[PDB]
Design a protein around this nucleic acid. Structure first.
Ligand code: ZN
Lengths: 1322, 613
DNA sequence: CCCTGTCTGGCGTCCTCTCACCTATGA
DNA sequence: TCATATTATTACGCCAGACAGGG
């Protein structure tokens, strides 16, 4: 079964693997994020409720008043989106917050407040999101791009080689909070442990332990295990668990139980450890040279004399043993400092530490953090207890606590946001374990360690900044609060929240201007994952590995769609199937594989889960049950693509598109292209201009439908049904009854956006693709947008291309084009330019909008009215006048009248004017006022009458259970109608019900039309300051010409060189010329062989189209057409499509065959595409030669090209790098102010920067005079250039050079220091 | 305001913005002669406004300057003749935007273009590194009269036919024209007109055009080659060469002095480069300019007549490829069955797997290379006989137009063992080429390997440019300022030998450098060359005949000149045949010639004899 | 007193094109 | 409108060059 615009032109779909999961809605990142930001979500997470439950209730410092929260709301926007783009306002909503002030008496923590007050106060306006994922910030339509940043939680990084210049590795460990202070631990090459906070000075790390109220003995209890020396019969024996001897040299005689176990000299092996454990060896008598290097663990004091023997962490000598042995401390605890495993890093750090107690530790930390200003007990304790341990200024989020517990192998995943003692101690323990050998480092490119911020998270963080500023303001006003004479807007202020949130949505590194020239380009700028932005890395610094593709990108980030240039691999684009995790990570679908049978259930994984499992490949042959048909299958285990068994796998890839994105999965035959040319192909495919006549890629991938629907450029039907099709203004859809609400009778009226300006000066235009009285279903398309054709996606157009050298005109990458391409207007794109004119009151009175243009004669008053301004429409070019806008006293008049820029033509399509309340002459301003005034009422009544007509009929329709008397129901016409009684049995109050409808309709229409006139009757609506505001919309129509840039989908760039006549083209023996000749020499080097298979398969597609065009032109009854269409849709191997063609009612075969006579469209999906034998077999169904190559004659000489050439249909696109936006020349005009050199650019009429390497190139020749005029006369020296212009126009090519002006600018800037630079003797 | 990249030195005093300048997108226009370029009419009327004003005021059509500015603002019918009379002999400086060496600013004569795109002669593109994928160039106008003469006499595009970094010609025919020549001068074992005899090259082209022979059909012709064996006198020798039809047609374009054996071979790209080089060394500059143009015209014309496409059938899969892959799969199966039983170590396993996949890759490449280089087997009057193939991708590879062994290898044979960004190789290769489909994992490993290359170029270019900057600012001063420093010291140029076969011969190192003391002939105490002779090609051939050991030659670092380098201790001019002139800045051309290849460079037991002596 | 980690400064590609956005305060 | 005058983030990579520390 198919929908009704699916039976229009059903694309022949190759593809063997049955898809199990359909493509998700391609704009779901932006929409789900911003729907999380604004939503009334009780339990607080996440959203605006999290912000209000963090900041509220505010209580002042015992001020006995506590403003609390109830509920918030967003009212209607005062401007809908279209008039918002026209006017220039933000597309925002007012944020109505209920606030409840309660005020206490004296001594009321528990006492009832003395008075309350509560109001729906107004703070800020937040910009809402348009239904397509965009904002409208100041008239322009902008997009917030999702950031990719390091997750909160601990990271163990190495930096193995570069420091110390000695090959010794370090190991640092960064505890990155979501909000607050950064804490880093790091080794130094003396093997000492150092802490630093916020990249400040370096403190030896155990001072932070001494800041957490840990004595030295507790620290040594933590990071070291005790070795027990017992004072015994002789020589102070040792408890020895045999694990501690692993891998060391036996220094002494190892004997016990009257038996010599291990002698001196040999290393202790694990067999000797087994001997000591089997022989149960713990207590052995040591020599005195064994204890002479060890370190004591805890303190010991001489008991009788009452003083100290040794401090904790002290190495031992023999006389120290003579001190402690004679006192009476029988147990001696020593620190086991294994040189292999258990290193003495904490102990040597304690030897570096200049502190001894907690208080000096806090004083040293306070002198680190805030220097100069003294370190007192209260100040240092408040500093360190609010560094990490308070809920205000340090907060690992839920993501941070999950990563923090996961990297430390904790059991739980939810905990408190602040740190604790045990967390810092665990980070130090894991860092020490990594130094010892056990456990390993983390990498930063691993996408399980890399979170995504999106629109709702970033706007929520900015909103929380605004709320903490307004709570500091509320704490300010409340302690100065006098009661009861204030209500909660003398306390609260709508200014900082609105200021912060407009600061983010206006001027941020991620709220950026939408690339809008294409439905692809909109939908792939909204799905963008940037590494840049605040808190992330920069373009000009880093690096090599963060610009590189890591094995966790499989199915999360597109490997091949990243922009070439200064930021490669920072501006990654998101994959097709990849959602976003609850915590913000990238989870991608996989198919759960319990046993041999691959189950059709899906299950989402992130990169910290994808490593543990074994995940199959998308294309591994499985037949009729899910069993892998091989006994071994290529999978990947832990980022390593390897071959595993038939029955080990736990997951399989869902579909074979899922590695790449929606820009580079529209490229058919992707798997045959090179990676570089697929990158250049996707990046150019974003840049296509919408042509005037949209044309359906013959070789597509089938993802055109989802991109053209999911990007909101087409008018997808909301509720299904039929159609009324007024359409000149709007599509009117009558709704079928099942999808139709009981009240609100209701028919859907779709607004078509006709010719208007895009963000890239292209033309966004919608055209209805459904006729009158034609069924449509829910989700079906109704109006084709820019670059769409019946709901598909038509960026460029499909043309007949020959691969051959043709007389040098396609030399390096150039492209030689027939005249049949430029006669048919099949690339003639439409550009629209907005031009503003304002008459601001700079000085010496205000400027004026009058045609009475001066000095200039009967060449001003022409394309305008008698009162000034361009008169609309017209064939305006360059140097014309659009808006007469000149002042007197500025015989002292001038010409600021905004004219048409140099080189452009066009037609004035629209003139907008919300000017300084006065623009009118004696009456046009109020003349049109009456026109709109009468317009509103007309439609207002019309619509009511339209429904009235439908209701009147409905009244009679229902008039059967309560008066069906046809001759007794046609009484009053426009007066009343139904007048019958009923009583009970069946409910027929319908008449009464519909009576209310009409009654309310007229009653509401009056009010509806009452406000209409009110709105109509007005000067105009805009902001203040600016006075004369005249915007004129030209529309140039640019065709194609030698110098434009065209390109296919594979990376084959080209500058169209010669626009040949039709005759000189290479025609085949049938007679048709070829349209575009490309060059075969690009194909062996640039290894993008996919354009040839697109060429052959498009040739086969148009072969079927020519065959259907013959069978339908030379008209046959529909049996032969349905037989040939059925053969065309069966065609070859096992596919997914076949068709159910004998259910197309003998007319939907014919409408399909009317829409196929330009070529049968073929879906070649991304990595499961059409094989070559099917291309040959499809070329045999059409009557074309199997090789793909036709013999071609030459249009010049009439004689055959030897060795037959390739002709086919490639889908070639026109990129928006047009040659009459690049052509520029300058002889003489205006310059800058500071310098005497020419200005730069094209919009400024400026000259070429003759840069540094061109000066070196002229020095490389003997061009001393060319360089002398190149930097003195042509550029800078003012006397030289005026003398040169007069010398040229006299006929004397001679320069009088002088000295450059910018060098005298250099002399004054150097001399304006204390520097006396001069110019010496003659 | 002083320091930095955007101070006054680097932004307003060393580089300035410039009037009488323009900029637009380039395109080909192959009808041009190589001293002229196409320049649009709109840019031409804007750049030449004062010359047009002066011309209009000379005729007497107008009076005041205003009238002339209204005339060209309206663009009447008479200013286009004025424009063709200000263009005619007035060169312009075309400039591609990343100018690295001095061949990136060249002066042309304009030919006016209906259009909006600069038409640029194709051979000159290999100097600018200019393809036509959206490039842009700037035009500058030499205003004064000394600058017009410097554009014609120093910077003209006919004057830059040798790269200043070496002796190699920079107007080498790039890509379409070598395919047209390689298809033209070739042969096949049977065609129309096999083994017929022709009375000249004129009727060879007449037999090709009328339709009686083929472009490659072996034939005895009678050609008259002019060998100039006397002292400046050209002696005619006429003979019958067993050659083809295409070699005679290409002999109609060769100038007089070159011998016929320069076209008798198959003419790839190295052969056409040394054809233009021998023409420049024998017949000088003007026949080499006109012969470079005639090469380009006949290459484009017969490449158009060739119809040399590319198809899907042209990439011939080896029939032996699948059995090679199965033998490699059996070998990795044996190694992993030893790995389950623990007989071998892990590093030796990884080394054995990379070794057998390298061996299988080389065998697949040899299978496809035999299957492409001699696939054509056509009979002539009897049994079969083999020849080199006319496969399209093989002529695009063998001609040296575009393609190598590696790229044609990746389109037919397996595309090797791609490496992960860890730097170590991946033990499971990409056994599928591009004609067969890559599946998902293989394309992802390919994207590892290609993203690393794009990141390397886009970060390598900054270090390459900063290296050229440091080099031209250490050089910056050094000007050829004498004619002889009057010394006897100079470095000892030997051929360099690393331990393999002799890498760079002495004729590459002592070509065009003036000897320090007089080289003794290797026999005994003979004055073979004198002590201040420039060693051009004739002297270097008389050095190679006598097998001279090593030459003590004068080097720039031994020059005794205070504040500059004398003219003998530099050497040959390198883009001029003679010695360096008194004046020509050699520090800047040297710094550009070292730093300009900075892009092409990368960024990131006992002795066994080989020969017998 | 001669090695030495450690800290501080100083580099990091040319040319071009499009767009938007610009200090608070205040009797 | 016309004088008043500066604070609560961190996440480059060498590579010279100068400086306090210590055998
Ligand atoms: Zn010298």
């Amino acid at each position: 079964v198919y929908s009704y615009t699916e039976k229009k032109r059903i694309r022949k779909d190759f593809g063997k693997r049955p898809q199990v999961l359909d493509v998700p809605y391609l704009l779901s990142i932006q929409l789900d994020s911003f729907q999380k930001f604004i939503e009334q979500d009780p339990e607080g997470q996440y959203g605006l409720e999290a912000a209000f439950r963090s900041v509220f209730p505010i209580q002042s410092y015992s001020g006995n008043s506590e403003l609390q929260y109830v509920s918030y709301r967003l009212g209607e926007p005062v401007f809908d989106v279209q008039e918002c783009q026209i006017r220039g306002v933000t597309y925002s909503a007012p944020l109505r917050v209920k606030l409840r002030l309660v005020i206490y008496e004296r001594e009321a923590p528990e006492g009832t407040v003395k008075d309350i007050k509560e109001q729906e106060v107004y703070m800020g306006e937040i910009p809402l999101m348009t239904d397509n994922g965009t904002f409208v910030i100041n008239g322009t339509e902008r997009v917030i791009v999702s950031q990719l940043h390091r997750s909160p939680g601990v990271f163990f990084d190495s930096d193995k080689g570069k420091t110390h210049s000695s090959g010794k590795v370090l190991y640092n460990a960064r505890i990155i909070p979501y909000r607050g202070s950064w804490l880093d631990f790091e080794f130094d090459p003396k093997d000492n442990l150092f802490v630093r906070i916020d990249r400040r000075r370096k403190l030896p790390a155990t001072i932070i332990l001494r800041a957490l109220n840990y004595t030295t003995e507790q620290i040594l209890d933590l990071f070291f295990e005790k070795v027990i020396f017992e004072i015994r019969d002789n020589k102070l024996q040792m408890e020895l668990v045999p694990e501690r001897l692993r891998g060391e040299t036996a220094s002494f005689d190892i004997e016990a139980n009257g038996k010599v176990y291990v002698e001196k000299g040999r290393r202790i092996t694990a067999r000797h450890i087994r001997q000591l454990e089997k022989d149960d060896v713990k207590l052995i008598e040591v020599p005195v040279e064994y204890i002479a290097g060890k370190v004591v663990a805890k303190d010991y004091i001489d008991e009788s004399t009452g003083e100290l023997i040794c401090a904790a962490n002290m190495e031992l000598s023999l006389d120290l043993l003579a001190k402690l042995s004679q006192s009476g401390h029988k147990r001696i605890e020593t620190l086991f400092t294994n040189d292999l495993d258990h290193g003495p890093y904490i102990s040597e750090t304690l030897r570096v530490d200049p502190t001894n107690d907690r208080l000096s530790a806090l004083v040293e930390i306070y002198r680190m953090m805030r220097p100069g200003e003294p370190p007192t007990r209260e100040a240092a304790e408040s500093l360190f207890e609010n560094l990490f341990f308070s809920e205000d200024r340090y907060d690992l989020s839920a993501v941070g606590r999950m990563k923090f517990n996961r990297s430390l192998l904790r059991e739980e995943i939810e905990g408190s946001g602040i740190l604790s003692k045990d967390d810092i101690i665990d980070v130090m323990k894991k860092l020490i374990d990594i130094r010892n050998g056990k456990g390993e480092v983390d990498d930063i490119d691993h996408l399980g360690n890399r979170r995504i911020r999106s629109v709702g998270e970033m706007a929520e963080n900015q909103f929380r900044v605004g709320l903490v500023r307004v709570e500091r303001a509320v704490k300010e006003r409340l302690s100065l609060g006098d009661l009861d004479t204030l209500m909660p807007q003398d306390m609260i202020n709508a200014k900082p929240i609105s200021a912060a949130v407009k600061e983010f949505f206006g001027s941020s590194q991620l709220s950026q201007f939408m690339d809008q020239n294409n439905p692809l380009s909109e939908i792939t700028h909204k799905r963008r994952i940037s590494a840049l932005g605040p808190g992330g890395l920069t373009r000009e610094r880093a690096g090599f590995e963060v610009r590189d593709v890591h094995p966790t990108h499989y199915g999360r980030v597109c490997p091949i769609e990243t922009p070439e240039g200064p930021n490669i691999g920072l501006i990654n684009s998101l994959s097709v199937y990849a959602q976003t995790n609850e915590y913000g990570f990238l989870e991608t679908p996989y198919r759960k594989v319990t046993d041999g049978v691959v189950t059709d259930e899906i299950h989402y994984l992130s990169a910290i889960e994808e490593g543990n499992y074994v995940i199959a490949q998308a294309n591994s042959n499985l037949d009729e049950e899910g069993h892998f048909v091989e006994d071994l299958v290529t999978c990947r285990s832990k980022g390593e693509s390897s071959l595993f068994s038939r029955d080990q796998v736990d997951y399989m890839d869902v579909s074979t598109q899922q590695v790449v994105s929606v820009g580079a999965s529209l490229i058919p035959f992707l798997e045959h292209d090179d990676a570089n040319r697929a990158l250049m192909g996707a990046n150019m495919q974003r840049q296509a201009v919408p042509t005037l006549r949209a044309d359906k890629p013959l070789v597509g991938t089938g993802m055109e439908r989802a991109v053209a629907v999911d990007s909101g450029v087409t008018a997808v039907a909301k509720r299904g049904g039929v159609v009324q099709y007024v359409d000149a203004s709007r599509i009117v859809i009558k709704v079928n009854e099942d999808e139709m609400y009981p009240g609100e009778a209701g028919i859907d009226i779709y607004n078509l956006t006709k010719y208007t300006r895009s963000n890239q000066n292209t033309c966004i235009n919608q055209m209805p693709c459904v006729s009158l009285g034609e069924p449509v279903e829910r989700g079906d398309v109704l109006a084709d947008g820019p670059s769409t054709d019946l709901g598909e996606l038509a960026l460029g157009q499909n043309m007949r291309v020959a691969f051959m050298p043709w007389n040098g005109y396609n030399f390096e990458d150039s492209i030689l084009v027939s005249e049949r391409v430029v006669q048919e207007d099949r690339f003639t794109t439409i550009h629209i330019q907005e031009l503003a004119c304002v008459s601001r009151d700079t000085k010496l009175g205000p400027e004026e909008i009058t045609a009475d243009i001066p000095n200039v004669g009967e060449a001003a008053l022409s394309k305008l009215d008698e009162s000034g301004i361009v008169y609309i429409g017209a064939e305006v070019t360059g140097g014309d006048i659009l808006v007469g806008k000149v002042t007197p006293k500025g015989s002292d008049v001038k010409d600021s009248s905004l004219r048409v820029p140099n080189g452009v033509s066009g037609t004035v399509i629209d003139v907008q004017v919300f000017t300084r309340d006065g623009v009118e002459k004696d009456k046009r301003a109020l003349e049109i006022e009456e026109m709109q005034l009468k317009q509103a009422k007309k439609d207002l009544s019309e619509e009511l009458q339209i429904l009235e007509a439908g209701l009147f009929s409905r009244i009679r329709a229902v008039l059967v259970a309560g008066g069906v008397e046809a001759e007794k129901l046609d009484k009053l016409p426009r007066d009343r109608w139904l007048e019958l009684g009923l009583t009970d049995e069946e409910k027929q109050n319908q008449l009464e019900q519909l009576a209310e409808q009409y009654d309310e309709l007229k009653h509401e229409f009056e009010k509806k039309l009452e406000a209409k006139r009110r709105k109509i009757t007005q000067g105009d609506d805009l902001a203040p300051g600016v006075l004369k505001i005249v915007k004129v919309y030209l529309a140039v129509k640019r065709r194609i010409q030698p110098g434009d840039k065209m390109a296919g989908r594979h990376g084959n760039k080209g500058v169209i060189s010669k626009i040949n006549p039709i005759e000189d083209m290479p025609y085949d023996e049938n007679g048709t010329p070829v349209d575009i000749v490309l060059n075969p020499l690009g194909v062996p080097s640039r290894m993008n062989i996919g354009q040839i298979l697109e060429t052959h398969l498009g040739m086969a597609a148009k072969g079927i189209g020519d065959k259907i065009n013959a069978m339908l032109k030379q008209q046959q009854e529909v049996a032969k057409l349905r037989e040939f269409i059925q053969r065309a849709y069966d065609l070859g191997a096992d596919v997914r499509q076949k068709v159910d063609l004998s259910t197309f009612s003998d007319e939907e075969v014919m409408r399909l065959a009317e829409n196929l006579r330009k070529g049968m469209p073929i879906a070649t999906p991304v990595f499961d595409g059409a094989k070559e034998a099917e291309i040959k077999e499809l070329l045999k169904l059409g009557d074309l030669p199997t090789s793909g190559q036709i013999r071609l004659y030459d249009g010049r000489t009439g004689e055959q090209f030897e060795r037959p050439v390739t002709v086919g249909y490639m889908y070639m696109l026109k990129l928006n790098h047009l040659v009459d936006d690049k052509m520029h020349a300058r002889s003489t005009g205006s310059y800058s102010l500071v310098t005497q050199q020419p200005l730069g650019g094209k919009a400024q009429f400026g000259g070429q920067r003759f840069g540094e390497m061109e000066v070196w190139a002229l020095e490389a020749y003997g061009a001393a005079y060319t360089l002398q005029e190149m930097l003195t006369v042509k550029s800078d020296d003012v006397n030289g250039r005026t003398k040169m212009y007069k010398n040229i126009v006299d006929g004397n090519h001679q320069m009088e050079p002088g000295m450059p002006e910018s060098f005298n600018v250099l002399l004054k800037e150097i001399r304006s220091l204390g520097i006396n630079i001069e110019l010496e003797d003659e | 305001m002083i320091k930095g990249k955007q101070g006054r030195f680097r932004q307003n005093l060393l580089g300035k913005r410039v009037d009488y300048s323009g900029r637009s997108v380039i395109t080909v226009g192959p009808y041009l002669r190589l001293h002229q370029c196409g320049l649009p009419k709109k840019m031409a009327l804007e750049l030449f406004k004062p010359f047009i004003y002066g011309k209009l005021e000379l005729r007497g059509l107008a009076t005041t300057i205003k009238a002339a500015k209204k005339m060209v603002e309206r663009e009447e019918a008479v200013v286009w003749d004025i424009l063709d009379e200000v263009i005619r002999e007035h060169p312009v400086l075309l400039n591609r935007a990343p100018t690295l060496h001095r061949l990136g600013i060249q002066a042309f004569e304009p030919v006016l273009i209906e259009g909006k795109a600069i038409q640029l002669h194709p051979l000159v593109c290999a100097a600018y590194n200019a393809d036509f994928d959206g490039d842009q160039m700037a035009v500058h106008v030499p205003l004064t009269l000394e600058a017009q003469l410097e554009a014609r006499a120093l910077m003209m595009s006919t004057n830059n036919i040798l790269s200043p970094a070496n002796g190699e010609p920079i107007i080498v025919p790039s890509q379409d024209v070598v395919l047209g020549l390689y298809y033209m001068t070739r042969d096949c074992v049977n065609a129309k007109g096999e083994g017929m005899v022709l009375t000249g090259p004129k009727e060879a082209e007449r037999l090709y055009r009328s339709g009686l022979a083929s472009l490659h059909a072996r034939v005895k012709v009678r050609i008259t080659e002019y060998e100039k064996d006397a002292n400046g006198e050209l002696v005619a020798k006429t003979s019958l060469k067993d050659t083809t039809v295409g070699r005679a047609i290409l002999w109609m374009i060769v100038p007089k002095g070159l011998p016929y054996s320069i076209v008798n071979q198959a003419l790839g790209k190295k052969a056409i480069s040394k054809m233009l080089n021998t023409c420049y060394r024998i017949l000088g500059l003007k026949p080499t300019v006109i012969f470079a143009d005639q090469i380009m015209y006949t290459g484009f014309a017969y490449a158009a007549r060739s119809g040399a496409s590319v198809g899907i059938d042209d990439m011939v899969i080896p029939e032996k490829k699948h059995e090679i892959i199965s033998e490699a799969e059996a070998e990795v199966a044996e190694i992993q069955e030893q790995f389950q039983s623990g007989l071998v170590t892990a590093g030796e396993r990884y080394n054995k797997v990379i070794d057998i996949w390298a061996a299988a890759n080389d065998r697949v490449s040899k299978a496809m290379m035999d299957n492409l280089q001699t696939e054509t087997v056509i009979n002539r009057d009897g049994q079969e006989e083999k020849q080199v193939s006319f496969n399209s991708i093989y002529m695009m590879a063998d001609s040296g137009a575009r393609g190598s062994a590696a790229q044609i290898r990746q389109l037919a044979g397996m595309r090797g063992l791609m490496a992960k960004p860890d730097g170590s190789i991946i033990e499971t290769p990409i056994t599928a080429n591009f004609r067969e489909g890559l599946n998902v994992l293989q394309y992802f490993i390919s994207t590892h390997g290609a993203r690393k290359g794009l990141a390397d170029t886009a970060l390598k270019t900054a270090n390459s440019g900063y290296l050229t900057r440091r080099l031209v600012d250490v050089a910056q001063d050094l000007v050829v300022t004498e004619d002889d420093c009057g010394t006897h010291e100079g470095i000892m140029m030997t051929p360099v030998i690393e331990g393999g076969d002799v890498k760079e011969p002495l004729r590459d190192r002592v070509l065009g450098r003036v000897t320090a003391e007089d080289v003794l002939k290797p026999g005994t105490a003979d004055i073979l060359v004198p002590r201040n002779t420039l060693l051009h090609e004739q002297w270097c051939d008389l050095l190679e005949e006598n097998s001279v050991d090593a030459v003590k030659v004068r080097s720039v670092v031994s020059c005794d000149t205070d504040f500059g380098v004398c003219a003998h201790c530099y050497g040959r001019d390198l883009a001029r045949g003679h010695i360096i002139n008194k004046g020509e800045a050699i520090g800047v051309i040297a710094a550009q010639s070292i730093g300009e290849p900075g892009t092409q460079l990368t960024m990131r037991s006992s002795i066994q004899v080989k020969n017998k002596g």
